Design a binder for this molecule. Structure first.
Ligand code: ADP
Ligand code: ADP
Ligand code: ADP
Ligand code: ADP
Ligand code: MG
Ligand code: MG
Ligand code: MG
Lengths: 538, 541, 520, 50
């Protein structure tokens, strides 16, 4: 019928559209499920320009590789919204949507309508929230213990790199959120940490710095790199020549006025710089071991570097926009644009400032702050792809530890929630059915589709999933024979059950929320889709 | 049964994407394919190594036995090779030599691990094996040190340092090039009774000025620098003043002009008559002050006007452009002055001293020589290379850059101690790691043994380039280590090498501790990445 | 320009590197096609058929590789199939490893490709010695052990479930073809197929099975004691050799010419009725008239029967190939025929010839196959060739070598122990022979899903102390001795595997350069 | 030796300095003779053919 409207159109309806949706989901599942867990494989995104990059997150794999199929675009957009708000759990979303469409399509072939199947997923979804809010546990984060944050960070960073690099990098994640905390307002910013890309000794030789680190060096050699006590000063207006906005030109009457009109531009430079020199000696004159550094966002005149070089003034330029907020948090200063009003109160303080010449560039290091409300992480590496790999590891690990402070509740990992949720969604007696023999088909499909996560971890480790889960369902049952909350997990070293809690594996509360909510919505709408169409004007 | 169903995941990722996962055979495809380029760096290894001519797409030909330099220009489509490419570049921008050792050791760990993967050992265990073997290698290298140096000032002490590095690249020239580099370092370092607290050193201190023609023996050392530039205005006196104050200007010497654009405005003809003399008297007020203090040389980075050049010719002041900004500051380090952008006039404190400046032709082209005697210098030197071809002089420059980079590798850390070279410490590490594997029972013992076998290429590669049998001198060398004297056993390269034993101290071949540690770490990290990947995803073009 | 060459001469070390990589690639295709848990392979030929199998020989027949070094590896399967008929995948998978292990040395320790050859002949000479010592004899007349010997190869195929019937099917067929030294040949083994039916009712029956029916309806469809007589000639008047041209002058000649056409066929039919046969099997076609009086005596006429099917009838019925009908006697007439009967099947008619069963010429037989489809028939037919091939080696050679990789592992241990006492330049290639012989158990462990690291380590620890018959159970993946496991293979297959694999390496190792595109 | 380049301008010479400069050499090994000839022409100015 569609060909009569547009001969150049196409349409798959009610059997070919369903196979496309399920095969595209299973095809996306079979490729991308291998990255799940610590034993997952590394992918090399080699584009046409030859750029090499190692990663295991499903967000960046699907972002660089354009998706041709229309179904997998909807799943990639779900991983984008998952990675956007949360930053973790993209591999669980594509596996749940692939398994839900697989388990649902098993029943659609048996002659069941898609409507009551999706109705069972929503009742099963709401039943999981009534199971999740009872399954979570509350802890007191006021103590600020380091042992809990390390093992929680180790659980997230083991799924990115091997063990020896995780042990070196897992203190860097815990050191990121030391001072950034507010009990009353409950405000916690993630963007204040600064990720610098540079080539140095090795990835395993990185370290945490308390204060700020800028990528700009001193232009003149005469200024001192070592400064024992520095008072920062924030500038935003550009010190160079700014053409008068209103078009203008110097028409000199004689040759004697040429150098005088050249000195007219020198007066406006000396006018705004004289207050800077007066600001230096206002604190104390002839004070050794006390420097004065200036951080400007816009450019600096090279003619003016001689003025800063004579008085031993460190000047940096072309700074970032978000760094202006980070200066006052680290150094404790105050941001200023003009130079009309100046005082020693607005100035910050720093205990140590130094520079290091690495290659054809120089990096400025500002450390030894009194009460800094921010910090930075140097991403050192032996190549170009390790920087992006460690950058994705930190950007995915910062969200896992930051959610512990946003909400004190935390779920045990190692597939404990998926295994425990399977039994609870078996038999809904008279709680929430809605109809006889209709909703229960979807309850069974949703319960069986959640257990693919612990099986996928076992497939990557190289053991049998049914054998290691037999003792596990069993362990949980024996636990039940005692009326006790013994949470069981999946250990990939020996192929046996373990306690998620005791051993050291956790998951964030918001990961499982948006993953189950996003997967159930996409799995529902794709089952409701009965026909694919295309139309347009080339 | 004619056309296949065409892999019904073809609705997924486009045809340009290629997957080469494992189980299918990715490891077997990779470790092998890279054996071609492994033989490239293997043949170019040692003092008798063969340089390789690489013609890039632009046509700039380069001929080198330096492996790194090679892989920068090679457009390599294989992604697994590129992990080894920029991993070697990290050694270049940092340590500066060994570019070839890190590539050979990184490739051999993949070649020798064929037995582990083929037998069926887990890939995750192999990464844990080499990591623990890497830690034992770093701890064990400190005990085999016998070259603890603390002077690092005199020229004869550098014969154990620079000459092994220069002996690798173009082995025939040892004493001549070592004299140029060692004499350059002595001019760079200051004269003092005790210079400590980590004195500063950089690779930009020693520069290389390439001159066409002349034998390599006729080269000499210059404390200043030499530019291919035409002087203007006059001939120098060369002994009369005995010393010359040199002002370096960033801005030019011209009637000063404004940033925003202006023009000449004249309301009447009275200003027209005085405008011709006003420009002359304006510069004369600023130029006469410069000549009062006796500044016999001016350097202006931008273009100098003819009006400013005319006033300087009669007083006999030397002029020079120096358009590039990087080489402008190096001249300031020689005289010991600071940049003075504005024309102005100057001061005794900011102006430096230069003994003499003389102009001649070294290879037919007129050049300006800033050589000075009895003057004070600080971090500046040059080596005038004379050679028959530009292609050969390019390799001498990188050999000197690797030589002075080793000086940066010594003086920047607290200790750059030596080690026995010529296939001496590598065979010792095979005995150490062989004994270490038996101490820890477990399934990872196979990885520890195969990690030691990868170090075998270092002695035999010197024997293969020497035209010797590997199955004779290599097992005979193990009998020499049975038992100080056993530590200084190495590989001989001579017609009398049938015995296969030559003492190291007769010729003083040594290697750096920090260079081999950084090479072993980057080599292990390079092999760690290639063995950790399983899937490789390509794209169109 | 110069002669048709020098396109891109692969010379030096890189030429041999491509051959080792190409030879290794042939074994990787059928790496999973070994052991009891081996996977099947469906290959698509360009004509339109399909070959479903796991035998390495049948797989490599259909494949086509445009490389000269890999084609020499392709021909080794024809060496094994047309010598014994079993272990073709074993030949291809072992050689790959031998070329691969010798490679490290060729590439790096620079041992010239001739010194490796001298090392392998001494390894080949020692391999036959230990294979002769490890093998134990077995009685040939023991039917209980013969059934377990025949089903050793069937266990690696689809019909292991019907192994109780296939061993009885193959044992009866081999003894029929066996001549009372003990030489047998599979050219009389009829591979006739019947699509459909159940495997249980499928059975061997003594005699032949035709695809045709009788010509005239009045022919007897059930004869108690048939008497078969083979004919080669046309039974009809034929044109004749020379330029003939009868010229007819009188009117009474043309009817005479057409009348002698009736009398000549009467003369050849009447002399056939001197012995009064019941069944006359003619090679070429038959006329409608001669058949009519063959009927006036009690014979039975059939359509043209190809030669092949008559040479089997000559050995079954005991008749001789006869063309001249005037020299037909009573001694050359076939006799002792059991039964004659024609069944109705929708495909075609089928005439059965049974034997009385009661030295002389060797008897032939036809094995009935009742599969599920056409590909199941061709799959089962190749299993009989692989199963009946095992029965020939025990008769030609009473020796019996242990299976399950125990024989090749025994070669690995003795060559490894003796390599230390073989001090010299030949030690490195001689020790590398054991590295490949321990892979043919490694492939079984990989297909079984176990870890070959600890199993092979446990294997070598128990092989020197426990016994020489230790091996890996392919189903369970544990160390189980072959004596209790009760599965054995002949020693002749082990000889051809070691000989053909090493002799293939000696040819390919001498390759220096490759030059393609010279001429036809 | 008479050489005529692609731009069609005649250039006759006896010494090997400018003969090799006219013929644009592609091969790197053949450029070695051209480099020493220009180097000998630049340094001394005699014996460029020998
Ligand atoms: N060490 C571990 N042991 C067992 N399970 C783990 C471990 N680390 C992570 N997991 C499981 O992997 C799942 C996803 O974690 P992760 O890989 O960090 O996110 P993503 O799959 O988005 O990269 C979690 O639900 C968790 O149960
Ligand atoms: N005359 C000689 N006798 C013995 N060995 C030598 C001689 N000259 C050079 N060598 C050896 O050749 C090797 C070349 O090493 P090379 O690859 O240049 O070092 P790197 O990898 O650090 O740059 C050195 O390790 C040195 O020991
Ligand atoms: N049940 C079994 N358990 C372990 N190994 C077996 C078993 N059956 C056969 N093998 C091994 O497989 C090899 C090939 O046997 P088979 O499959 O019969 O020949 P082909 O390779 O020609 O198919 C033999 O060398 C034998 O060691
Ligand atoms: N008058 C002469 N008699 C003998 N030999 C000569 C004479 N002139 C030149 N020669 C020799 O012949 C060679 C001439 O070199 P030639 O090719 O003519 O000049 P160039 O080498 O500059 O191109 C020189 O090696 C020189 O030794
Ligand atoms: Mg994660
Ligand atoms: Mg077989
Ligand atoms: Mg001449």
């Amino acid at each position: 019928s569609l060909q009569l409207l547009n001969p150049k159109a196409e349409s798959l309806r009610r059997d070919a559209a369903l196979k496309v949706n399920v095969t595209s989901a299973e095809g996306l599942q079979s490729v991308l499920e291998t990255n799940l867990g610590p034993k997952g494989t590394l992918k090399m995104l080699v584009d046409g320009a030859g750029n090499i990059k190692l990663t295991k997150d499903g967000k960046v794999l699907l972002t660089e590789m354009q998706i041709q199929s229309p179904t997998a675009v909807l799943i990639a957009r779900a991983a984008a919204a998952q990675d956007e708000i949360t930053g973790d759990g993209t591999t669980t979303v594509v596996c749940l949507v692939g398994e839900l469409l697989r388990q649902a399509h098993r029943f659609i072939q048996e002659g069941v309508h898609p409507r009551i199947i999706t109705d069972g997923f929503e009742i099963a979804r709401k039943e999981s929230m009534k199971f999740l809010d009872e399954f979570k546990i509350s802890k007191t984060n006021l103590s600020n213990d380091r042992e809990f944050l390390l093992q929680v960070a180790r659980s997230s960073l083991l799924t990115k790199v091997d063990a020896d690099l995780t042990e070196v990098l897992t203190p860097i994640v815990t050191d990121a959120v030391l001072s950034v905390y507010d009990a009353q307002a409950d405000n916690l910013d993630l963007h204040m940490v600064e990720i610098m890309q540079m080539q140095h000794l090795s990835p395993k030789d990185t370290t945490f710095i308390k204060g700020l680190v800028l990528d700009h060096g001193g232009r003149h050699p005469d200024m001192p790199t070592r400064v024992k006590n520095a008072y920062v000063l924030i500038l935003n207006v550009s010190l160079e020549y700014e053409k008068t906005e209103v078009n203008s030109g110097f028409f000199y009457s004689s040759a004697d006025q040429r150098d005088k009109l050249a000195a007219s531009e020198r007066k406006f430079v000396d006018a705004k710089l004289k207050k800077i020199i007066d600001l230096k000696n206002e604190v104390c004159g002839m004070d050794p071991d006390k420097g004065f550094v200036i951080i400007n966002q816009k450019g600096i005149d090279p003619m003016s570097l001689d003025v800063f070089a004579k008085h031993n003034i460190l000047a940096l330029r072309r700074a970032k926009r978000r760094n202006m907020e980070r200066l006052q948090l680290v150094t404790g200063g105050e941001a200023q644009n003009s130079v009309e009003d100046l005082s020693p109160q607005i100035l910050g303080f720093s205990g140590l400032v130094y520079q290091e010449t690495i290659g054809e560039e120089k990096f400025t290091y500002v450390t030894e702050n009194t009460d800094p409300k921010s910090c930075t992480i140097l991403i050192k590496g032996s190549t170009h792809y390790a920087l992006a790999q460690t950058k994705d590891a930190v950007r995915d690990g910062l969200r896992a530890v930051a959610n512990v402070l946003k909400d004190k509740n935390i779920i045990p990992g190692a597939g404990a929630f998926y295994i425990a949720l399977s039994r609870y969604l078996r038999s809904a007696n008279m709680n929430k059915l809605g109809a006889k023999g209709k909703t229960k088909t979807g309850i069974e499909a949703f319960a069986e589709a959640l257990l693919v996560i612990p099986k996928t971890l076992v497939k990557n480790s190289g053991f049998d999933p049914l054998d290691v889960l037999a003792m596990v369902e069993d362990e949980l049952d024996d636990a039940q024979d005692s009326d006790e909350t013994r949470y069981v997990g999946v250990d990939l070293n020996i192929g046996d059950s373990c306690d998620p809690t005791i051993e050291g594996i956790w998951d964030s509360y918001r990961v499982l929320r948006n993953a189950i909510t996003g997967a159930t919505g996409i799995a529902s709408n794709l089952l409701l889709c009965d026909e694919l169409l295309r139309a347009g004007r080339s | 049964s004619l056309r296949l169903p065409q892999n019904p995941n073809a609705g997924l990722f486009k045809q340009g994407y290629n997957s080469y996962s494992n189980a299918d055979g990715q490891i077997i495809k990779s470790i092998a394919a890279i054996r071609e380029l492994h033989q490239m760096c293997l043949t170019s290894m040692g003092p008798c190594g063969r340089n390789k001519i690489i013609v890039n797409h632009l046509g700039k030909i380069i001929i080198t036995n330096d492996a790194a330099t090679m892989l920068r220009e090679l457009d390599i489509v294989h992604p697994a090779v590129k992990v080894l490419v920029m991993a070697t570049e990290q050694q270049k921008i940092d340590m500066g030599d060994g570019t070839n050792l890190v590539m050979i050791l990184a490739g051999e760990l993949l070649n020798v691990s064929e037995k582990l993967i083929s037998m069926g050992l887990s890939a995750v265990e192999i990464i844990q094996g080499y990591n623990m073997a890497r830690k034992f290698t770093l701890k064990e290298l400190d005990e085999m040190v016998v070259g603890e140096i603390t002077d690092k000032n005199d020229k004869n002490e550098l014969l154990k340092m620079i000459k092994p590095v220069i002996s690798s690249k173009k082995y025939g020239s040892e004493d001549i090039l070592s004299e140029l580099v060692s004499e350059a370092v002595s001019h760079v370092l200051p004269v003092a009774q005790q210079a400590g607290e980590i004195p500063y050193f950089n690779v930009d201190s020693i520069r290389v000025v390439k001159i066409m023609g002349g034998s390599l023996s006729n080269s000499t050392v210059i404390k200043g620098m030499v530019f291919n530039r035409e002087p203007e205005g006059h001939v120098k006196s060369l002994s009369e003043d005995k010393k010359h104050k040199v002002a370096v200007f960033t801005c030019p010497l011209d009637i000063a002009n404004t940033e925003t654009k202006g023009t000449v405005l004249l309301h009447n003809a009275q200003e027209m008559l005085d405008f011709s003399k006003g420009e002359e008297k304006q510069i004369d007020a600023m130029m006469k002050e410069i000549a009062d203090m006796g500044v016999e040389c001016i350097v202006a980075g931008a273009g100098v006007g003819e009006l400013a050049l005319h006033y300087l010719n009669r007083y006999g002041i030397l002029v020079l452009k120096v358009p590039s900004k990087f080489e402008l500051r190096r001249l300031c380090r020689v005289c010991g002055a600071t940049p003075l952008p504005r024309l102005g006039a100057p001061t005794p404190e900011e102006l430096g001293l230069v003994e003499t400046v003389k102009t001649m032709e070294i290879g037919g082209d007129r050049v300006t020589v800033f050589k000075q005697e009895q003057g004070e210098i600080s971090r500046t030197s040059t080596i005038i290379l004379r050679g028959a071809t530009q292609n050969n002089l390019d390799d001498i420059e990188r050999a000197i850059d690797d030589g002075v980079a080793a000086v940066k590798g010594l003086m920047k850390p607290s200790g750059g101690k030596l080690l026995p070279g010529a296939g001496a410490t590598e065979i010792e590490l095979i005995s150490r790691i062989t004994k270490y594997g038996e101490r820890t029972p477990g399934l990872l013992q196979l990885a520890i043994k195969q990690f030691a076998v990868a170090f075998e290429v270092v002695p035999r590669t010197l024997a293969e380039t020497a035209g010797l049998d590997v199955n004779e001198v290599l097992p005979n060398l193990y009998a020499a280590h049975n038992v100080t004297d056993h530590l200084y056993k190495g590989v001989d390269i001579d017609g009398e090498s049938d015995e296969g034993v030559k003492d190291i101290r007769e010729e003083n071949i040594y290697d750096m501790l920090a260079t081999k540690k950084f090479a072993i770490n980057v080599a292990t990290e390079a092999a760690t990445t290639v063995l950790s990947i399983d899937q490789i995803i390509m794209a169109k073009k | 320009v110069f002669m048709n060459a020098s396109q891109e001469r692969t010379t030096g070390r890189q030429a041999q590197i491509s051959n080792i990589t190409a030879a290794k690639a042939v074994a990787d295709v059928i790496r999973t096609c070994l052991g009891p848990k081996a996977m099947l392979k469906m290959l698509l030929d360009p004509m339109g058929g399909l070959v479903l199998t796991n035998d390495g020989h049948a797989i490599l027949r259909e494949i086509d590789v445009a490389h000269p070094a890999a084609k020499s590896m392709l021909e080794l399967s024809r060496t094994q199939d047309e010598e014994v008929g079993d272990g073709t995948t074993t030949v291809i998978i072992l050689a790959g490893e031998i070329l691969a292990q010798c490679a490290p040395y060729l590439i790096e320790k620079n041992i010239h490709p001739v010194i490796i050859i001298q090392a392998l002949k001494k390894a080949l000479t020692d391999a036959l010695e230990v294979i002769k010592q490890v093998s134990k004899p077995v009685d040939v007349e023991n039917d209980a052990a013969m059934k377990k010997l025949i089903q050793a190869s069937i266990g690696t195929k689809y019909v292991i479930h019907w192994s109780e019937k296939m061993c009885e099917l193959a044992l009866d067929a081999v003894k029929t073809v066996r001549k009372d030294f003990e030489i047998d040949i599979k050219r009389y083994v009829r591979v006739e197929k019947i699509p459909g039916g159940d495997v249980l009712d499928s059975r061997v029956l003594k005699g032949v099975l035709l695809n045709k029916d009788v010509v005239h309806p009045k022919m007897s469809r059930h004869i108690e004691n048939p008497r078969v007589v083979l004919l080669d000639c046309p039974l009809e008047y034929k044109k004749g050799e020379s330029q003939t041209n009868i010229e007819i002058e009188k009117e009474e000649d043309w009817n005479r010419i057409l009348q002698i056409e009736e009398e000549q066929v009467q003369l050849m039919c009447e002399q056939i009725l001197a012995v009064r046969p019941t069944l006359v099997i003619t090679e070429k076609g038959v006329s409608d008239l001669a058949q009519h009086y063959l009927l006036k005596g009690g014979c039975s006429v059939l359509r043209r029967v190809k030669k092949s099917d008559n040479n089997r009838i000559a050995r079954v019925t005991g008749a001789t190939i006869v063309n001249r009908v005037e020299d037909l006697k009573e001694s050359d007439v076939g006799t002792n025929c059991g039964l004659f009967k024609v069944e109705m099947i929708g495909d075609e008619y089928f005439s059965f010839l049974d034997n009385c069963k009661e030295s002389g010429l060797q008897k032939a037989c036809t094995i009935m196959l009742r599969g599920g489809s056409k590909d199941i028939l061709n799959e089962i037919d190749r299993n009989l060739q692989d199963a009946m091939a095992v029965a020939r080696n025990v008769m030609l050679s009473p020796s019996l070598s242990p299976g399950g990789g125990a024989t090749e592992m025994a070669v690995s241990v003795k060559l490894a122990e003796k390599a230390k006492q073989l001090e010299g330049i030949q030690q490195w290639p001689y020790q590398a022979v054991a590295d490949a012989m321990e892979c043919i158990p490694r492939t079984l462990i990989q297909n079984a899903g176990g870890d070959p690291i600890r199993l092979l380590s446990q294997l070598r620890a128990k092989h020197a102390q426990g016994n020489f018959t230790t091996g890996i159970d392919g189903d369970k993946g544990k160390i189980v001795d072959m004596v209790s496991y009760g599965i054995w293979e002949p020693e002749v297959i082990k000889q051809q595997s070691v000989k053909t694999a090493i002799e293939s390496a000696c040819l390919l190792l001498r390759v220096d350069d490759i030059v393609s595109g010279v001429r036809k | 030796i008479l050489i005529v380049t692609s731009n069609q301008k005649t250039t006759i010479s006896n010494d090997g300095a400018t003969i090799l400069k006219l013929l644009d050499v592609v091969h790197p090994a053949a450029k070695t003779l051209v480099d020493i000839s220009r180097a000998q022409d630049a340094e001394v100015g005699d014996g460029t053919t020998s």
